[PDB]
């Protein structure tokens, strides 16, 4: 019958963007990305010091923050500085927005691990 | 071991350690005085 919009039969939480006449992709609003294990669903992300929390307006003050972030004043998700905090990395630690890099050795080259300790 | 009674616990850096008393600390101390 050419051509079919694949999104007509899609069940995305937020939006749907067509790829082919047969395939599509469920996408999210800016600041959100599909959940890896739930591709039709969305979850907030942040790559800075802070980003507004994902709060549900159907229930007062129920907010979500991505991993590595913690709710702060003004319902904002702020980055947890695992290096300054301590206890997350015993080797050399570099803080990241959302996680941290832990360098472990004491051998040559040294392994750069993301989000895990030595 | 734990619970031996030798550990350094119960002393606040900003209070007992500096010989400073908090606002209502006296109230608890005054409750110990029993009426004969």
């Amino acid at each position: 019958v050419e051509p079919v919009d694949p999104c007509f039969r899609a069940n995305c939480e937020y939006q749907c963007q067509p790829l082919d006449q047969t395939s599509y992709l469920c996408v999210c609003a800016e600041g959100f990305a599909p959940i890896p294990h739930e591709p039709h669903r969305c979850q907030m992300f942040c790559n800075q010091t802070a980003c507004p929390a994902d709060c549900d307006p159907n229930t007062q003050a129920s907010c979500e923050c991505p991993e590595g972030y913690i709710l702060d004043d003004g319902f904002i998700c702020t980055d947890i500085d695992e290096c300054e905090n301590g206890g997350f990395c015993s080797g050399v630690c570099h803080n990241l927005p959302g996680t941290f890099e832990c360098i472990c050795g004491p051998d040559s080259a040294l392994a750069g691990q993301i989000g895990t300790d030595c | 071991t734990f619970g031996s009674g030798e550990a350094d616990c119960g002393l606040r850096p900003l209070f007992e350690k500096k010989s400073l008393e908090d606002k209502t600390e006296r109230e608890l101390l005054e409750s110990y005085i029993d009426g004969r």
Binding site: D73, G87 | C9, L14, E25, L28, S31
Partner: protein
């Protein structure tokens, strides 16, 4: 905390905040009893009737906090939970008897002006301090009023709350409720004729009921905010988990599962 006041910076360095990751919210209070052990109430973590069952990865342990909402960077410290130990004989079926749980932290917390463990009472401390009329202290970030209906108040505090409450004689605690009271619990709070008031409330559970020793000037955790009926009602008293009575179990899991 109902009828309390703003805690001073460093007033309760042992006060711990159990924080739920999803959604991001206060779960309950707790206490630091060593550099790797945290004490709280069992009902905060497990209550089958409501299908409540929080595991190590569902929470964050926040030590050294003052403000309820602010992320106190470089002041507060976040500790990861290695293992939660709920008392095997915790009676969620009826009384909430033995409402107690231990949490071993993955790494030892760094002591500071805002972080420092409270002492646990020994036999003598418990006998000398745990007497009717003697005042203890309760702290927490819980509700400022019984809420959950109509009520004029700020709801949740902006800063850690503190209240001084006197221990009540056992028979008066017994006659105030129809719920069976065990020796693993004690009640505290003012009587109607005293005028002064105050009480723990929702969200305060797990927080410590401490007493300062007139002998050695150290603070001891005599109780854990466990339960009550409403909050700050006349003729009602907050019920606390008797720490000394369960000290044998505390010492058992800490010795077996290491310090």
């Amino acid at each position: 905390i109902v009828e309390g006041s703003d805690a001073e910076i460093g007033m309760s360095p042992w006060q711990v905040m159990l924080f739920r990751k999803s959604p991001q919210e206060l779960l309950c209070g707790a206490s630091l009893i060593s550099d790797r052990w945290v004490l709280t109430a069992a009902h905060c973590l497990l209550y089958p009737p409501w299908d409540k069952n929080f595991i190590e990865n569902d929470l964050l342990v926040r030590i050294g906090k003052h403000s309820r909402t602010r992320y106190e960077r470089n002041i507060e410290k976040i500790s990861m939970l290695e293992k939660i130990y709920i008392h095997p004989r915790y009676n969620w079926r009826e009384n909430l008897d033995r409402d107690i749980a231990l949490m071993k932290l993955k790494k030892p917390v760094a002591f500071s002006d805002y972080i420092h463990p409270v002492c646990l009472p020994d036999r003598e401390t418990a006998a000398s301090l745990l007497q009717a009329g003697y005042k203890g202290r309760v702290t927490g970030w819980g509700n400022l009023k019984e809420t959950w209906t109509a009520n004029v108040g700020k709801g949740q505090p902006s800063v850690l709350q503190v209240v001084n409450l006197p221990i009540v004689e056992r028979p008066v605690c017994k006659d105030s409720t129809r719920i069976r009271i065990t020796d693993n619990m004690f009640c505290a709070g003012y009587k109607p004729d005293e005028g002064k008031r105050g009480d723990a409330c929702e969200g305060d559970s797990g927080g410590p009921f401490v007493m300062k020793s007139p002998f050695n000037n150290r603070w001891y955790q005599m109780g854990i905010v466990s339960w009550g009926e409403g909050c700050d009602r006349d003729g009602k008293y907050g019920f606390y988990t008797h720490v000394f009575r369960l000290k044998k179990w505390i010492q058992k899991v800490i010795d077996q599962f290491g310090e």
